[PDB]
Nucleic acid binder design. Structure first.
Ligand SMILES: [Mg+2]
Ligand SMILES: [Mg+2]
Ligand SMILES: [Mg+2]
Ligand SMILES: [Mg+2]
Ligand SMILES: [Mg+2]
Ligand SMILES: [Mg+2]
Ligand SMILES: [Mg+2]
Ligand SMILES: [Mg+2]
Ligand SMILES: [Mg+2]
Ligand SMILES: [Mg+2]
Ligand SMILES: [Mg+2]
Ligand SMILES: [Mg+2]
Ligand SMILES: [Mg+2]
Ligand SMILES: [Mg+2]
Ligand SMILES: [Mg+2]
Ligand SMILES: [Mg+2]
Ligand SMILES: [Mg+2]
Ligand SMILES: [Mg+2]
Ligand SMILES: [Mg+2]
Ligand SMILES: [Mg+2]
Ligand SMILES: [Mg+2]
Ligand SMILES: [Mg+2]
Ligand SMILES: [Mg+2]
Ligand SMILES: [Mg+2]
Ligand SMILES: [Mg+2]
Ligand SMILES: [Mg+2]
Ligand SMILES: [Mg+2]
Ligand SMILES: [Mg+2]
Ligand SMILES: [Mg+2]
Ligand SMILES: [Mg+2]
Ligand SMILES: [Mg+2]
Ligand SMILES: [Mg+2]
Ligand SMILES: [Mg+2]
Ligand SMILES: [Mg+2]
Ligand SMILES: [Mg+2]
Ligand SMILES: [Mg+2]
Lengths: 117, 64, 144, 201
RNA sequence: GCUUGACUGCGAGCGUGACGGCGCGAGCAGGUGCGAAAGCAGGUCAUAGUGAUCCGGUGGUUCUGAAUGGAAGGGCCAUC
RNA sequence: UAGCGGCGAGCGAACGGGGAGCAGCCCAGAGCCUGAAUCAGUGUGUGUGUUAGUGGAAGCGUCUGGAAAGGCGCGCGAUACAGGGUGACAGCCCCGUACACAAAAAUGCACAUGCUGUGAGCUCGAUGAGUAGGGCGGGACACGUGGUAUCCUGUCUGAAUAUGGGGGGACCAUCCUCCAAGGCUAAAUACUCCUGACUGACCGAUAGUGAACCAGUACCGUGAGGGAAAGGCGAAAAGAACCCCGGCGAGGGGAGUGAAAAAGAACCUGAAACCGUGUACGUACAAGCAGUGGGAGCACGCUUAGGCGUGUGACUGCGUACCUUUUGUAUAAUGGGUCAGCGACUUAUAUUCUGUAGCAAGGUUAACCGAAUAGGGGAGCCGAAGGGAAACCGAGUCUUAACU
């Protein structure tokens, strides 16, 4: 029962090299280098599914801050005001309104200012 | 081939009813005048092989 | 029932271990041998009873006894063996013929092990106190 | 237990332990696997590093060249080298306990009865050792893939069955576990049923 | 002062050890010393003062004893 | 196992039992009767085997296709459906196969028989001496000098004579058993350079022989010796007439053959590393494992828009390869130029445990026989009894004079 590895081996390398498309030089050509590239790509992708959630919130906060300050209040006091006013709209939605509905965002600031008064 | 008994072990241990091994106590060969009668009396009856040593004896005696 | 519809019982054909076949397997690289030393090596390991060099147990301890050549030609008979002989008479020859005792056995003892239900005549055999009571109770006889 | 005869419309009194026992799949599997293993020839070998042709000369010096250390030109790491765990002829036969063999036969026969694959007849023979005669008898009986078990060896029946791939002829003494399963129907003679019953107690 | 308990067989129960081991022990049987008696004594206030196994020597022994009776040799107990 | 054994590592019987096979004779000498049993050499005859061989059943239509053995329809042979070949997979086309047969000549083995040589049967004898034994040194016995029997003998010695001698594991007695110092002998047993037939859960060109091939070659070495690489066009060469560029080149473009030249001789398939030509997108103010998360723009598809696929990736957050070895490695420690193929926990026998199956106070047979994976074979082995060094006793036993 002599077993030849060729067909199984070729399929394994091809599977890795297909995931390596777009990478520079040996990384998209040479199995050994491509294999290490694909693992690192997965490692960073795992890490950055967590990091994406951090980066987006950091961006929403920065935008709410800019728009809050345009209406004469800081981000910190505005978030506190909305909490005391029982407003449950999150940072993703608040940053959207800050850009696309400046009148509605001003209305949210008045609601926050009222709850701190 | 058949496992070979450690023939020196076969001359020192005997398998008992429940699977353990009996042996003769050490220290009752010579230098006996200095030894207490109490001490030498308790070394006369055969003793049982300890838990830590069973594996070693059993390895030496595959046909016991 | 067909040559392609027959299966072994569950748990009767456990797959063997295959060392050195990658991470996923749980037995890759060192193959369950750990790291370095004598035991990790091909053909590596110490002999039976070896303890590192300390006088081993089968050497620390003294030898005892002698082998009795008489014990090897002496057999024991159970009460449950008396009914297995052809004829109702239990001798050295009857027990040998019934395959109860060895061909080279020269002495035998009937012991209180099992039961005797039929009357039997025991001849030229030693009988224990208890086996004598059992044989006689079942209507048997014990002669020299 | 009674077995209905095909065209004779009689009944044969058989042992319920032989033809009416429950199917033990695990037991049957072990005996059929052992039988197929017993059919194995085991004739093969490869050469170890000791058996490959060439000399014991160290290919190059231990140190100084920059090459990995070599010892044998017959190293199993090397092209043309020995086989690491080279095969030797081996005996693949297994022991089958007498009782396990008989119990498997009993289980097979009982399933053949249960699946209506066992056909009992008074007699089964042919006039001459002619394949055409048996082919015609099987066509008339509505049989194609079948095992014929006779009481005693029938020479004309044996010769007539030889060129028929879907047909085998056995005497009751020569039955085996794989043959009892390998065919669609099993035709047994009244004398063969009597003989198999005595075999299987 | 008198003496040989520096006793022989055992030992509930413990301690301390990876183990081989080592230690403490009341009580039981036999026999003994001292004391009027209750009692005490299985060495020394206690904790060092030691050498496993193999091989071999000496004495003892309801054990074994290669045809059988012996014997040699072996075992067991004491000891070197 | 019993033993042997720096009683270490190891070494390792026999008695007895089950089987295969079975066969017994001659000389140590003379007489009587004489070529009487056997064996070898060898003429002839027959049987049979080998070394060439002979015969050996039964299919056609249609479809696809370059080609039919394939699909479909209907037949037929089979003691032959083992296998191979034939333009794709054939019981019926070809060679075979089952079965039935054959030798002028040489030869093997049997019996029958001729011849030369050898001697059968009977009676009365005879009965292996530098031998057995011993001292010394060694060796062989499972047995290492041990309490060491038995065997061989290099050296020195040295009996008895069947009213005798050897052995029964120191040695002695008793008893039992055998008869050394002369020789022969088939079978069951071991093996494979070679011949023929067949078979394989053996390999299939880095495998299997070193060698599928003009290989023990080429090549290396003074020599002994060492020792490769290297298979595939197509069904058939139909292996490319003829024309053109070119050096009466190499190489190529046409033509033609062919089913195909997406088979052209470096020839089936034709992977990967590696190197080009073309297009899309990005890139000349920009610093690091080269990705990943966000993400504009461009290109190209969608959907009959729908802020969506695919390629690219300005700009931006985070981010020092993998293996190994280590307390700890981006480590300036180890290993790897890259790819493809190969490359390392196996196998046999013991032994124990777990799972599983059978049978169960029983379970199971080994060699072998065989009716051959059956059945026979229970020789054995493990278990239902232990305790004690043992004799021995025994559901107990040992310890001790005896155990609370
Ligand atoms: Mg690519
Ligand atoms: Mg990381
Ligand atoms: Mg002693
Ligand atoms: Mg395995
Ligand atoms: Mg390592
Ligand atoms: Mg270490
Ligand atoms: Mg280790
Ligand atoms: Mg027996
Ligand atoms: Mg090879
Ligand atoms: Mg069998
Ligand atoms: Mg007094
Ligand atoms: Mg004697
Ligand atoms: Mg051996
Ligand atoms: Mg025999
Ligand atoms: Mg015979
Ligand atoms: Mg023909
Ligand atoms: Mg084709
Ligand atoms: Mg003589
Ligand atoms: Mg002699
Ligand atoms: Mg001695
Ligand atoms: Mg003797
Ligand atoms: Mg002779
Ligand atoms: Mg051959
Ligand atoms: Mg090759
Ligand atoms: Mg190839
Ligand atoms: Mg040309
Ligand atoms: Mg054409
Ligand atoms: Mg062309
Ligand atoms: Mg090609
Ligand atoms: Mg720029
Ligand atoms: Mg740079
Ligand atoms: Mg960074
Ligand atoms: Mg370091
Ligand atoms: Mg680090
Ligand atoms: Mg490095
Ligand atoms: Mg390097």
């Amino acid at each position: 029962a002599r077993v030849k590895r060729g067909v199984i081996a070729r399929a394994r390398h091809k599977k890795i090299l297909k995931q390596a498309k777009g990478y520079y030089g040996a990384r998209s050509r040479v199995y050994r280098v491509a294999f290490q590239a694909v693992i690192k790509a997965g490692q960073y992708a795992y890490r950055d599914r967590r990091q994406r959630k951090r980066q987006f919130r950091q961006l929403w906060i920065a935008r709410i801050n800019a728009a809050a300050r345009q209406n004469g209040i800081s981000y910190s006091k505005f978030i506190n005001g909305l909490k005391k006013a029982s407003v449950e709209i999150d940072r993703k939605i608040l940053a959207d309104i800050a850009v696309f509905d400046k009148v509605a965002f001003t209305a949210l600031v008045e609601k926050a200012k009222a709850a701190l008064a | 081939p058949k496992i070979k008994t450690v023939r020196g072990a076969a001359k020192r241990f005997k398998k008992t009813g429940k699977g353990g091994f009996k042996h003769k106590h050490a220290n009752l060969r010579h230098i006996l005048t200095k030894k207490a009668t109490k001490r030498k009396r308790h070394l006369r009856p055969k003793a049982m092989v300890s838990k830590g040593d069973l594996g070693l004896v059993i390895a030496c005696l595959p046909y016991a | 029932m067909r040559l392609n519809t027959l299966s072994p019982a569950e748990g009767s054909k456990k797959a063997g271990k295959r060392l050195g076949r990658g991470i996923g397997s749980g037995l890759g690289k060192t193959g369950g041998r750990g790291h370095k030393g004598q035991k990790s090596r091909s053909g590596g390991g110490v002999r039976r009873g070896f303890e590192g060099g300390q006088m081993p147990l089968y050497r620390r301890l003294p030898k005892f006894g002698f082998t009795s050549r008489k014990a090897a030609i002496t057999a024991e008979i159970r009460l449950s063996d008396l009914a297995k002989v052809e004829g109702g008479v239990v001798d050295l020859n009857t027990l040998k013929a019934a395959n109860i005792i060895g061909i080279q056995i020269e002495f035998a003892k009937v012991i209180l092990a099992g039961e005797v239900t039929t009357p039997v005549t025991v001849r030229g055999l030693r009988v224990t106190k208890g086996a004598r009571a059992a044989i006689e109770a079942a209507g048997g006889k014990i002669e020299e | 237990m009674e077995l209905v005869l095909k065209d004779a419309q009689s009944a044969l009194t058989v042992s319920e332990t032989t033809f009416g026992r429950d199917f033990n799949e695990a037991l049957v599997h072990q005996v059929v696997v052992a039988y197929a293993a017993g059919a194995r020839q085991g004739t093969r070998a490869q050469k170890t590093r000791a058996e490959v042709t060439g000399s014991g000369k160290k290919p190059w010096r231990q140190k100084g060249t920059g090459r990995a250390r070599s010892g044998s030109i017959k190293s199993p790491i090397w092209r043309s080298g020995g086989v690491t765990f080279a095969a030797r002829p081996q005996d693949h036969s297994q022991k089958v306990n007498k009782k396990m063999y008989r119990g498997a036969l009993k289980s097979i026969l009982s399933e053949l009865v249960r699946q209506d694959r066992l056909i009992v007849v008074e007699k089964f023979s042919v006039e001459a050792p002619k394949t055409k005669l048996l082919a015609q008898k099987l066509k008339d009986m509505a049989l194609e893939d079948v095992l014929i078990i006779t009481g005693e060896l029938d020479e004309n029946l044996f010769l007539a069955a030889r060129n028929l791939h879907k047909v085998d002829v056995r005497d009751a003494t020569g039955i085996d576990p794989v043959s009892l399963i390998a065919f669609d129907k099993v035709v047994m003679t009244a004398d063969a049923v009597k003989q198999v019953e005595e075999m299987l107690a």
